[PDB]
Homo-oligomer: A and B are copies of this chain.
Amino acid sequence: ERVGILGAGIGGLYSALILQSLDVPFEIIEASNRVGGRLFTHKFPNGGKYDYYDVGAMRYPLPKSDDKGNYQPGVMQRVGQLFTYLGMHKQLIPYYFKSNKSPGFQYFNGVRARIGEGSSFDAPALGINSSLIDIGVTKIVNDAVGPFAQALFDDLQKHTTTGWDDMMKNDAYSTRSYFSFKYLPSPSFGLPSEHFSTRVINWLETFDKSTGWYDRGLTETVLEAIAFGEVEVDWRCIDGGSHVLPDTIAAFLHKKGGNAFVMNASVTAIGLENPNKEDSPMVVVAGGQKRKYSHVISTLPLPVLRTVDLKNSKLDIVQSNALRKLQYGPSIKIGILFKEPWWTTGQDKNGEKFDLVGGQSYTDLPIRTVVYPSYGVNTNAPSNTLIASYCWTNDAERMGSLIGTGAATYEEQLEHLVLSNLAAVHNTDYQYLKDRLVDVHSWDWNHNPLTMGAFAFFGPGDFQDLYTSLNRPAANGKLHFAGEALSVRHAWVVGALDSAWRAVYNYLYVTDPAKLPKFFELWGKNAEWFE
């Protein structure tokens, strides 16, 4: 008995942590020379301790916790418990979702304001009537999403699935088609009892999410509202960057027997050695070597599995369709090392102090979102590193064309666009920011063979039609699909952890069910249902 774990991201590392706690031998096979996957911290050459940024995961909306690292029940309790398990609870530092001093900026339709100032951003000229403006995007979206989200939250608290059944009755909607064809405003709003026009729906998307978000599944909008805590959370980040979490797990696993890492070994084939024999082991071809396992837990992204030879893994027809159709979404980030944290200490072209500490600014310009660092802000050397752009969906697709070209001329075009946008958002001259620029690092998760997308971002119907097929094993029960796509917390670490819980659960169920009581005791009786 020995489990092959494919991928040393947080899903594979957590699977390994569970198996080691239950004395199950395993091996982790990793294509690259690094552990952590989409926990990827870039530290700028020649910068200080806090001159890094997180290219992937960077913020954790955790439940409240006590002095000992005991977490209240909640959506991300499993992440919190993982930090505590590893002795990391005291290395968690505040993440400021909003600025800890003056509010961040909003810059839309050429109108600049602070978050909370109640600007309408010229929406009357767009044809948004004053009644809608007075209610506001947040309240409108909450009225539509809230009923679904409350039922799913009740499922988690009460250990039911009726909320999910109702969500699936509505899973053929995109957020857009929900607003266009089903949603009617609460009568308390005093609005006409008719579906919103596309102009109004596009106004909602502009201020609620990212360009194109509303054409993906309604269910994803509901689940992400739950994940972001809108249904209190302690926002945290990891001192030194998210890489500390996978590095800490790998260091622990390396100090112990029953396991080993196989690095720099890309998987090219997965299948039963002999599919007609009931006791057949699994074979994984990685780095040109055949390795044999009793069972395999894959944490490879679904589009990556589509590049692997799965002949003799005996996927059923729904599973093989799911690998292709279950939809992924794109994302880019651009980090800039400056000479000083000008957003904290500087002033705009008219002498007005920005006075920003952590938090975010938002704009309809191509950069879309700016994230000021929360790490290091009270130390003797605050971060000089900015997340100058963080984009999703169409905004990320478009920006990705300027990233990773290898050509100086496009690198210069990209820098000039980003600085020009930043200048407009903050009301500075371009040269103010250029004079302070040191170094630029950019990343496109949709131009990366190890991810082939940033993360799962399902279209309408995906959850109701294809998702469950991959929670069944393949390969006569010996191939288990995991990774964040196999969760209802897409684009979160907790999604990867939940998928690992379910894969090990199934593995134990079919091979050694006497270990189930200890598995439940250490890692929970359920993946998602609250403690």
Question: Interface of A with B (CB < 8 Å)?
Answer: 109-110, 122, 125-126, 171-174, 176-177, 180-181, 197-199, 201-202, 206, 211-212, 215-216, 266, 268, 303, 306-307, 309, 316-318, 320-321, 324-325, 327-328, 330, 364, 366, 394-395, 397-398, 400-402, 404-406, 410, 413, 416-417, 420, 444, 446-449, 451-453, 459-461, 464-466
How many Å lie between the Cα of A320 and that of B202 in the bound state? Answer: 13
| Nearest-neighbor residue (CB-CB) of A407 within chain B | B449
Q: How far is the CB of A471 from chain B (nearest CB, A)?
A: 17
Q: Which of B180, B320, B325, B394 contacts A327 (CB 8 A)?
A: B394
Could you pull out 26 A-B pairs where Cβ atoms are within 8 angstroms? A109-B317, A109-B320, A122-B317, A125-B316, A126-B317, A172-B176, A176-B460, A176-B461, A177-B177, A199-B465, A215-B215, A215-B216, A215-B460, A303-B398, A306-B366, A306-B398, A307-B402, A307-B417, A327-B394, A328-B397, A398-B452, A398-B453, A401-B447, A401-B448, A404-B447, A406-B406
Q: Using Cβ atoms and an 8 Å threshold, which residues of chain B touch A465?
A: 197-199, 202
Q: Using Cβ atoms and an 8 Å threshold, which residues of chain B touch A201?
A: 461
Task: Give the residue among A181, A215, A330, A364 with the most B Cβ atoms within 10 A.
Answer: A215
Q: Using Cβ atoms and an 8 Å threshold, which residues of chain B touch A309?
A: 420
Does the CB pair B460–A413 fall under 8 Å?
Answer: no
Q: How far is the CB of A410 from chain B (nearest CB, A)?
A: 5
Q: Which of B172, B202, B451 contacts A401 (CB 8 A)?
A: B451
Q: How far is the CB of A362 from chain B (nearest CB, A)?
A: 14
Q: Using Cβ atoms and an 8 Å threshold, which residues of chain B touch A197?
A: 465
Q: Using Cβ atoms and an 8 Å threshold, which residues of chain B touch A126?
A: 317-318, 321
Q: Which of B172, B394, B400, B413 contacts A177 (CB 8 A)?
A: B172
Q: How far is the CB of A319 from chain B (nearest CB, A)?
A: 11
Q: Which of B171, B212, B327, B444 contacts A459 (CB 8 A)?
A: B212
Q: Using Cβ atoms and an 8 Å threshold, which residues of chain B touch A453?
A: 397-398, 401
| Nearest-neighbor residue (CB-CB) of A302 within chain B | B398
Q: Using Cβ atoms and an 8 Å threshold, which residues of chain B touch A366?
A: 306-307
Contacts A177-B177, A444-B447 known; list 16 others, CB within 8 Å: A125-B317, A173-B177, A174-B174, A176-B460, A198-B464, A202-B321, A202-B466, A206-B325, A212-B327, A215-B460, A268-B416, A325-B394, A401-B446, A401-B447, A401-B448, A402-B449
Q: How far is the CB of A20 from chain B (nearest CB, A)?
A: 31
| Nearest-neighbor residue (CB-CB) of A402 within chain B | B449
| Nearest-neighbor residue (CB-CB) of A417 within chain B | B307
| Nearest-neighbor residue (CB-CB) of A465 within chain B | B198
Q: How far is the CB of A221 from chain B (nearest CB, A)?
A: 14
Q: How far is the CB of A518 from chain B (nearest CB, A)?
A: 39
Does the CB pair B397–A330 fall under 8 Å?
Answer: yes
Q: Which of B180, B212, B402, B459 contacts A172 (CB 8 A)?
A: B180
Question: What are the nearest 3 A-B pairs in CB distance?
Answer: A198-B461, A177-B177, A172-B180
Q: Using Cβ atoms and an 8 Å threshold, which residues of chain B touch A176?
A: 172, 174, 459-461
Q: Using Cβ atoms and an 8 Å threshold, which residues of chain B touch A416?
A: 268
How many Å lie between the Cα of A413 and that of B450 in the bound state? Answer: 12
How many Å lie between the Cα of A461 and that of B181 in the bound state? Answer: 12
Q: Using Cβ atoms and an 8 Å threshold, which residues of chain B touch A397?
A: 328, 330, 397, 446, 453
How many Å lie between the Cα of A198 and that of B466 in the bound state? Answer: 9
Q: Given contacts A174-B174, A176-B461, A460-B215, is CB(A447)–CB(B400) below 8 Å?
A: yes
